[PDB]
Write an enzyme that holds these catalytic residues in place. Structure first.
Site, mmCIF file in Angstrom:
data_model
loop_
_atom_site.group_PDB
_atom_site.id
_atom_site.type_symbol
_atom_site.label_atom_id
_atom_site.label_comp_id
_atom_site.label_asym_id
_atom_site.label_seq_id
_atom_site.Cartn_x
_atom_site.Cartn_y
_atom_site.Cartn_z
ATOM 1 N N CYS A 126 -8.329 8.764 6.660
ATOM 2 C CA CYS A 126 -8.433 8.603 8.170
ATOM 3 C C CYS A 126 -7.083 9.403 8.424
ATOM 4 O O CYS A 126 -7.097 10.055 9.658
ATOM 5 C CB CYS A 126 -8.364 7.327 8.450
ATOM 6 S SG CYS A 126 -9.617 6.162 8.619
ATOM 7 N N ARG A 186 -7.678 10.870 12.105
ATOM 8 C CA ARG A 186 -8.854 11.315 12.474
ATOM 9 C C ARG A 186 -9.980 10.175 13.331
ATOM 10 O O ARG A 186 -10.889 10.875 13.816
ATOM 11 C CB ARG A 186 -9.800 12.182 11.630
ATOM 12 C CG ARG A 186 -10.135 11.180 10.444
ATOM 13 C CD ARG A 186 -11.225 11.885 9.206
ATOM 14 N NE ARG A 186 -11.406 10.785 8.434
ATOM 15 C CZ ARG A 186 -12.378 9.970 8.674
ATOM 16 N NH1 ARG A 186 -13.101 9.560 9.651
ATOM 17 N NH2 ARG A 186 -12.407 9.007 7.655
ATOM 18 N N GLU A 211 0.894 -1.266 -0.049
ATOM 19 C CA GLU A 211 -0.046 0.156 -0.111
ATOM 20 C C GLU A 211 0.895 1.311 0.249
ATOM 21 O O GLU A 211 0.673 2.345 -0.801
ATOM 22 C CB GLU A 211 -1.025 -0.114 1.254
ATOM 23 C CG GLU A 211 -1.901 1.004 1.033
ATOM 24 C CD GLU A 211 -2.585 1.462 2.516
ATOM 25 O OE1 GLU A 211 -1.792 1.467 3.362
ATOM 26 O OE2 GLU A 211 -3.889 1.338 2.622
ATOM 27 N N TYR A 218 -4.910 9.105 -1.568
ATOM 28 C CA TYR A 218 -3.719 9.472 -0.759
ATOM 29 C C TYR A 218 -2.569 9.905 -1.883
ATOM 30 O O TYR A 218 -2.020 10.795 -1.866
ATOM 31 C CB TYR A 218 -3.138 8.529 0.187
ATOM 32 C CG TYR A 218 -4.032 8.267 1.582
ATOM 33 C CD1 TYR A 218 -3.943 9.222 2.480
ATOM 34 C CD2 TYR A 218 -4.903 7.392 1.407
ATOM 35 C CE1 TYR A 218 -4.529 9.386 3.651
ATOM 36 C CE2 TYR A 218 -5.585 7.078 2.899
ATOM 37 C CZ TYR A 218 -5.680 7.863 3.797
ATOM 38 O OH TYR A 218 -6.187 7.896 5.016
ATOM 39 N N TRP A 273 -8.454 -2.069 -0.661
ATOM 40 C CA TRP A 273 -9.047 -1.028 -1.378
ATOM 41 C C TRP A 273 -10.009 -1.431 -2.270
ATOM 42 O O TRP A 273 -10.746 -0.598 -3.012
ATOM 43 C CB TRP A 273 -8.086 -0.033 -1.921
ATOM 44 C CG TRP A 273 -7.255 0.932 -0.886
ATOM 45 C CD1 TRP A 273 -6.416 0.443 -0.190
ATOM 46 C CD2 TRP A 273 -7.601 2.237 -0.640
ATOM 47 N NE1 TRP A 273 -5.682 1.594 0.455
ATOM 48 C CE2 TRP A 273 -6.701 2.674 0.517
ATOM 49 C CE3 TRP A 273 -8.573 3.018 -0.789
ATOM 50 C CZ2 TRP A 273 -6.621 3.650 1.079
ATOM 51 C CZ3 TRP A 273 -8.698 4.413 -0.199
ATOM 52 C CH2 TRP A 273 -7.598 4.749 0.766
ATOM 53 N N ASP A 319 -10.073 2.662 14.402
ATOM 54 C CA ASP A 319 -10.438 1.134 14.747
ATOM 55 C C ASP A 319 -9.326 0.663 15.505
ATOM 56 O O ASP A 319 -8.175 0.228 14.977
ATOM 57 C CB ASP A 319 -10.924 0.188 13.707
ATOM 58 C CG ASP A 319 -11.540 -0.978 14.041
ATOM 59 O OD1 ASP A 319 -11.029 -1.488 15.159
ATOM 60 O OD2 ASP A 319 -12.454 -1.086 13.274
HETATM 61 O O1 LIG Z 1 -6.556 3.509 7.792
HETATM 62 C C1 LIG Z 1 -7.570 3.231 8.141
HETATM 63 C C2 LIG Z 1 -8.943 3.313 7.518
HETATM 64 C C3 LIG Z 1 -10.155 3.113 8.104
HETATM 65 N N1 LIG Z 1 -10.091 3.057 9.546
HETATM 66 C C4 LIG Z 1 -11.350 2.633 10.362
HETATM 67 C C5 LIG Z 1 -11.661 3.816 11.323
HETATM 68 C C6 LIG Z 1 -13.191 3.827 11.102
HETATM 69 O O2 LIG Z 1 -13.813 2.753 12.120
HETATM 70 C C7 LIG Z 1 -13.395 3.262 9.971
HETATM 71 C C8 LIG Z 1 -13.585 4.353 8.976
HETATM 72 O O3 LIG Z 1 -14.840 5.099 8.781
HETATM 73 P P1 LIG Z 1 -14.938 6.541 9.196
HETATM 74 O O4 LIG Z 1 -13.935 7.237 10.407
HETATM 75 O O5 LIG Z 1 -14.818 7.743 8.008
HETATM 76 O O6 LIG Z 1 -16.312 7.218 9.846
HETATM 77 O O7 LIG Z 1 -12.164 2.497 9.374
HETATM 78 C C9 LIG Z 1 -8.976 2.927 10.417
HETATM 79 O O8 LIG Z 1 -8.734 2.654 11.573
HETATM 80 N N2 LIG Z 1 -7.547 3.212 9.689
HETATM 81 C C1 LIG Z 2 -10.278 1.113 1.849
HETATM 82 C C2 LIG Z 2 -9.702 0.776 3.104
HETATM 83 C C3 LIG Z 2 -9.974 -0.088 4.126
HETATM 84 C C4 LIG Z 2 -8.887 0.286 5.268
HETATM 85 N N1 LIG Z 2 -8.692 -0.182 6.233
HETATM 86 S S1 LIG Z 2 -7.029 -0.491 7.002
HETATM 87 O O1 LIG Z 2 -7.215 -0.119 8.341
HETATM 88 O O2 LIG Z 2 -6.021 0.323 6.246
HETATM 89 C C5 LIG Z 2 -7.138 -2.163 6.979
HETATM 90 C C6 LIG Z 2 -5.876 -2.758 7.143
HETATM 91 C C7 LIG Z 2 -5.883 -3.964 6.806
HETATM 92 C C8 LIG Z 2 -7.045 -4.831 6.538
HETATM 93 N N2 LIG Z 2 -7.188 -6.323 6.333
HETATM 94 C C9 LIG Z 2 -8.338 -3.945 6.305
HETATM 95 C C10 LIG Z 2 -8.281 -2.852 6.668
HETATM 96 N N3 LIG Z 2 -8.163 1.243 4.483
HETATM 97 O O3 LIG Z 2 -8.546 1.469 3.340
#
Ligand SMILES: O=c1ccn([C@H]2C[C@H](O)[C@@H](COP(=O)(O)O)O2)c(=O)[nH]1
Ligand SMILES: Cc1cc(NS(=O)(=O)c2ccc(N)cc2)no1
Ligand SMILES: O=c1ccn([C@H]2C[C@H](O)[C@@H](COP(=O)(O)O)O2)c(=O)[nH]1
Ligand SMILES: Cc1cc(NS(=O)(=O)c2ccc(N)cc2)no1
Lengths: 278, 279
Positions: free
Chosen positions: B168, B188, B60, B108, B82, B191
């Site tokens: 994010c 911002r 990525e 990005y 993605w 998870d």
């Molecule tokens: O790089 C990332 C991309 C997504 N999320 C998580 C955060 C949120 O749980 C959800 C994104 O939704 P929103 O913050 O836009 O509402 O996925 C991450 O933690 N890291």
């Molecule tokens: C789209 C999208 C989802 C996302 N979430 S994330 O946090 O990058 C991610 C990382 C690993 C796995 N398995 C799933 C989601 N980032 O971009």
């Protein structure tokens, strides 16, 4: 609450590294810090040294009406920006064609007209660009769970036109239990002068938007990038760490205002503010 | 151990977070505002209390760096993170029926390399257009490491409606002292149970890559969170993960002297001694 700002100053004195800067004077510097100031029935105007509250309020009102004109704020008896709108400073950056007071596309332009093509401080930008301030207010009202409630002043494309790059790159708002919180990302912070002011600015902004949105002020999270103390201000601060903090004042808004643009100076009263002298 | 910071943050959310809803209606425990400092000196912060998709991290980032906004160009490396956001149905729901499958919009890769240019599609040529923030950052670290403005910003309010998802990772900032390069990410929304360990690895890696290029040693990665949350249905697996003791962080080795950021390839990198707890 103020203990956190004091503990942060102590930390930089005790663990910061010597780091030269653009001004050549030198600092003690820590990269990355964070403090949480409650806004619940108090306002974080610092007590161990007087903060220029008139400046905080008028500068924010200046920001809100979209002005990039240093004279518009000077006329309020707040001259913070005047030196950066001076003729020689603007010529120092190749802006000879610019009028004195034209700061370029700084906070006011970015908060109300992000992405618009800047011309000068007198141009009409109505309907141009993204009105981030109002977008934030709408989203708080309509979708307080949204995790994208951001206002961003850092504009890579407009940076060469600004009189100086914004220290306050962006802030984020947050709602839970009917409480409105705000996190500022400040890329560079002078703990001896700017920082106590900047804490006031964004706590004030949070109070204003919580008033407009029917919410209670929650927390103000302050996040710093380069948090520093100029070497020649170490002794005043060591004195100040000695002074015990007195309780934070409170902030009262003297009437029910409906839009962020309707706020004016006389709607705000700081009561209980007993700072130590300097 | 630096992973303890992450674990204390997870625990703090389970004990003091507030049950707030979100856009998927699923429900979270949430804390607004957190910060952690992951040292990068002779170790790499790839979390051990749960395996992190390191292949996904590396690919990525390489995808980001070469400016791509085509989900298929990352999918074709075996990283499908993605893909769903560039699907045919997903794109049609946002109002992008004239966009080819995989066109994520000005996300990005576009913002880092061409901030401010007019997005057409993913296959367009944007050479020379917009601000190259990634290279400006690299240049400033070399010529003026004391600079307090070394920032790379992906949050573009003008382009937000064009994106498959709002980013994010709104911005990161770099810092140099004592020959060490540090990085602060403003995230911002996070998870704690899935993205965050991955996100910590992304920007730590980016710091390793840019330190290599500029002749510096990795310093700290500082992780700053706005809405730090855990989804309600993941409370129990995480609380079992919190009683696991972290293993020492692996090390990251760069197998070759690389001159520019565009020249890194997957084979230039090796994670050594990565022993995560199983699940
Ligand atoms: O790089 C990332 C991309 C997504 N999320 C998580 C955060 C949120 O749980 C959800 C994104 O939704 P929103 O913050 O836009 O509402 O996925 C991450 O933690 N890291
Ligand atoms: C789209 C999208 C989802 C996302 N979430 S994330 O946090 O990058 C991610 C990382 C690993 C796995 N398995 C799933 C989601 N980032 O971009
Ligand atoms: O709102 C502000 C504006 C400026 N500064 C300080 C921090 C730095 O010492 C100096 C700005 O210089 P640079 O970070 O751009 O180099 O002013 C603040 O603390 N708060
Ligand atoms: C430009 C510019 C300088 C600046 N300085 S500052 O650090 O915010 C400040 C605050 C109060 C006082 N009295 C002086 C300076 N803010 O914007």
């Amino acid at each position: 609450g103020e203990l956190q700002y004091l503990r942060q100053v102590e930390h930089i004195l005790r663990c910061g590294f010597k780091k030269e800067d653009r001004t050549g004077t030198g600092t003690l510097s820590v990269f990355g810090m964070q403090a949480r100031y409650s806004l619940r029935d108090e306002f974080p105007l610092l007590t161990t040294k007087r903060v220029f509250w008139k400046g905080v309020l008028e500068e924010l009102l200046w920001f809100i009406k979209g002005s990039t004109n240093a004279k518009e704020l000077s006329s309020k008896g707040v001259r913070i920006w005047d030196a950066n709108g001076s003729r020689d400073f603007l010529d120092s950056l190749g802006f000879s064609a610019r009028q004195e007071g034209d700061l370029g596309p700084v906070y006011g332009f970015q908060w109300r007209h992000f992405g618009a093509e800047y011309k000068d401080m007198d141009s009409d930008y109505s309907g141009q660009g993204v009105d981030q301030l109002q977008k934030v207010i709408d989203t708080i009202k309509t979708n307080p769970d949204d995790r994208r409630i951001i206002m961003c002043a850092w504009n890579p494309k407009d940076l060469p036109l600004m009189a100086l790059p914004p220290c306050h790159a962006l802030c984020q708002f947050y709602v839970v239990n009917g409480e409105l919180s705000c996190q500022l990302y400040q890329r560079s912070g002078d703990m001896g002068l700017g920082v106590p002011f900047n804490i006031a600015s964004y706590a004030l902004l949070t109070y204003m938007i919580a008033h407009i949105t029917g919410l209670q002020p929650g927390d103000f999270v302050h996040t710093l990038g380069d948090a520093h103390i100029y070497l020649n201000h170490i002794e005043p601060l060591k004195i100040q760490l000695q002074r015990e903090p007195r309780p934070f004042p409170k902030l009262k808004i003297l009437r029910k205002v409906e839009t962020i643009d309707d706020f004016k100076v006389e709607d705000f009263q700081i009561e209980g503010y007993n700072p130590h002298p300097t």
